[PDB]
C-alpha cells in the first residue's frame, strides 16, 4: 500500500538511532581511541628504550 | 508451519556452513591479533628490563 511513502516511524526511528549515536560516541569511540594511542605510545617507547639502552651500554663501556 | 520447518532446516545448514568454514579462519585471525598484542606487551617489558640493566651497568662504570 504505497509502502514507499514515509510514515511517522521516520521520526521515531531517528530518535532511537540518535540514542545509539550517543552511546557509541560516548563510551566506545573515546576509549578505543585512547587505547590505540596508548598502544602506539607503548610501541614507540619500546623502540626508543631499546635504542637508548644500546646507546647507554655503549657509553658505559666507553666511559 | 511447513515453511517454518523448511526455513529451520535452512538455518541449520547455514549454521553448519558457518561453524565449519568461516568460524575457524576468523577465530584464527582473532587469536593471531591477541597473541600479537601479548607479544608486544612482552617485548615492552623486556625492553624496560634491558634499559634497567643498562642503567645498572652505567652505574657499574
Amino acid at each position: 500500500s504505497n509502502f514507499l511513502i514515509p510514515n511517522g516511524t521516520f521520526f521515531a526511528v531517528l530518535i532511537i538511532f540518535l540514542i545509539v549515536l550517543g552511546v557509541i560516541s560516548k563510551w566506545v569511540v573515546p576509549p578505543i581511541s585512547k587505547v590505540l594511542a596508548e598502544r602506539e605510545a607503548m610501541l614507540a617507547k619500546t623502540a626508543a628504550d631499546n635504542r637508548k639502552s644500546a646507546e647507554q651500554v655503549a657509553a658505559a663501556q666507553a666511559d | 508451519m511447513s515453511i517454518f520447518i523448511g526455513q529451520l532446516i535452512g538455518f541449520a545448514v547455514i549454521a553448519f556452513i558457518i561453524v565449519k568454514w568461516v568460524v575457524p579462519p576468523v577465530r584464527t585471525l582473532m587469536r593471531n591479533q591477541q597473541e600479537a598484542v601479548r607479544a608486544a606487551l612482552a617485548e615492552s617489558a623486556e625492553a624496560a628490563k634491558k634499559l634497567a640493566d643498562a642503567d645498572a651497568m652505567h652505574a657499574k662504570a
Binding site: P6, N7, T9, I32 | M1, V37
Partner: protein
C-alpha cells in the same frame, strides 16, 4: 500467496501512524548494539590482551579512522569517526539479525517473519539518509560559512557546470537511502518467494540466499559508512 508492505503492529499516536514491527526491530538492534558498547566499556583493557569484543571494535574504529584520515585529516572532523562507526555497526547488526530462523506461516497461506529487517521500511532508511544529509551539510556550513557553503556547492569543482552540481547534491540523500532499501527489500522478497516452495525443498534455496544475504548486508553497511565518510570529506573541503 505473498504480500508486501502490510506492516504488523501499526499504531497511531498524535495523528501519526507508526509501523510497530519496524520500531520493535530497530529497538532490538539498538539494544544489541548498546549491549555490545557497554560490554566493551566494562572490558576495555589497554595493557591486557584485547578481548574479542575489543578486537571487533578496534577493527571497526581503525578502519573508519583510516578512511577518514585518507579523505580528510582527523584534526578537522573527529565526530565523523563515531558517526560512521555507529552507522556501520547499526546497519550491519540489523541486516545480520535479519537471518535468524524466525519465518513462519500465518495460516492464511502467507508467510511472515517475527523479525523483519528495519531497512525494509522506507522510514528507517530515509531517517538515516536525511540525518547524514543534515549532518554533513551542517559540517560544511561550519567549515566554510552560512553564505559560503551554498555558493561552494553551487560552483562545486567547476563553476561552468552550475546546474548539474545541484542535481548531484539532491542525489546525495536519495542515493544513500534507496540503495540500502533495495538491497534489503529485495531480500525480504526472495525468502518470501522461497516460502512458496514445499518444506522438503524450501531449505536449499533459502539457505543459499540467506548465506549470500550475510555478505550482501555486510557490503551494504560498509558502503553506507564509507560513502558517509566521503560525503563529509567532500563537504568540508575548504
Amino acid at each position: 500467496a505473498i504480500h508486501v508492505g502490510h506492516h504488523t503492529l501499526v499504531f497511531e499516536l498524535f495523528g501519526m501512524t507508526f509501523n510497530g514491527d519496524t520500531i520493535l526491530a530497530t529497538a532490538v538492534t539498538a539494544v544489541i548494539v548498546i549491549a555490545l558498547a557497554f560490554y566493551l566499556r566494562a572490558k576495555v583493557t589497554s595493557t591486557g590482551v584485547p578481548s574479542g569484543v575489543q578486537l571487533f571494535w578496534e577493527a571497526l574504529t581503525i578502519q573508519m579512522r583510516q578512511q577518514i584520515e585518507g579523505s580528510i585529516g582527523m584534526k578537522i572532523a573527529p565526530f565523523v569517526l563515531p558517526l560512521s562507526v555507529t552507522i556501520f555497526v547499526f546497519i550491519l547488526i540489523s541486516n545480520w539479525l535479519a537471518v535468524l530462523p524466525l519465518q513462519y506461516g500465518g495460516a492464511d497461506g502467507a508467510a511472515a517473519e517475527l523479525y523483519k529487517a528495519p531497512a525494509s521500511d522506507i522510514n528507517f532508511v530515509l531517517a538515516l539518509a536525511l540525518f547524514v544529509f543534515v549532518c554533513y551539510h551542517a559540517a560544511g556550513i561550519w567549515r566554510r560559512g552560512i553564505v559560503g557553503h551554498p555558493i561552494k556547492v553551487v560552483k562545486g569543482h567547476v563553476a561552468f557546470l552550475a546546474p548539474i552540481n545541484i542535481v548531484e547534491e539532491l542525489a546525495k540523500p536519495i542515493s544513500l537511502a534507496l540503495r540500502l532499501f533495495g538491497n534489503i527489500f529485495a531480500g525480504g522478497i526472495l525468502v518470501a518467494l522461497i516460502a512458496m516452495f514445499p518444506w522438503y525443498i524450501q531449505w536449499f534455496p533459502n539457505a543459499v540466499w540467506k548465506t549470500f544475504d550475510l555478505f550482501v548486508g555486510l557490503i551494504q553497511a560498509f558502503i553506507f559508512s564509507l560513502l558517509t565518510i566521503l560525503y563529509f570529506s567532500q563537504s568540508m573541503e575548504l
